[PDB]
Design a binder for this molecule. Structure first.
Ligand SMILES: O=C(O)c1ccc2c(c1)N(CC1CCC1)C[C@H](c1ccc(Cl)cc1Cl)CO2
Length: 145
């Protein structure tokens, strides 16, 4: 699955850099995908901060067996709705928000697994749409400014 490896690399690096605050095959897209993500994902976290605040709170993340359980509550929400790049970035954006919180409570070791949960669901349930959109090229294309 190349579409998956690439999605995991992107979402993973975004999540890791967002939490750490420090930067870390299908090259000439991934770099633009990550670039677009930083821009719009940051916007989404900013303009939607109080809703993110409240959700993180509703979630109550205290430890490792809180992230695992997460997938339940997460598939529930990304899966209810229409497919568009706007709901995908909010999916990944909140993921970034959770990652920020994890490094706060010493559970940075659960960031990569978190990025996996997110990636598994994004490409497991909308893989065909992604293929249709030409993957991350569609993403970058959609958000040009
Ligand atoms: O309604 C939408 O357009 C919408 C689209 C996607 C989306 C969400 C809302 N949610 C809910 C909102 C309120 C706080 C963000 C977060 C959720 C989610 C993403 C990542 C993790 Cl790590 C856990 C969860 Cl639970 C699933 O991703």
């Amino acid at each position: 699955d190349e579409l998956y490896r690439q999605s995991l690399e992107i979402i993973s690096r975004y999540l890791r850099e967002q939490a750490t605050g420090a930067k870390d095959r299908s090259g000439a897209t991934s770099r633009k995908a990550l670039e677009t993500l930083r821009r719009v994902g940051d916007g989404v976290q900013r303009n939607h901060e109080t809703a993110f605040q409240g959700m993180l709170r509703k979630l109550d993340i205290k430890n490792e067996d809180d992230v695992k359980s997460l997938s339940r509550v997460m598939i529930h929400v990304f899966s209810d709705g229409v497919t568009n790049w706007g709901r995908i970035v909010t999916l990944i954006s909140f993921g970034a928000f959770v990652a920020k919180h994890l490094k706060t409570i010493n559970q940075e070791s659960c960031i990569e697994p978190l990025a996996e949960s997110i990636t598994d669901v994004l490409v497991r349930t909308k893989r065909d749409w992604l293929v249709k959109q030409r993957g991350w090229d569609g993403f970058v294309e959609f958000f040009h400014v």
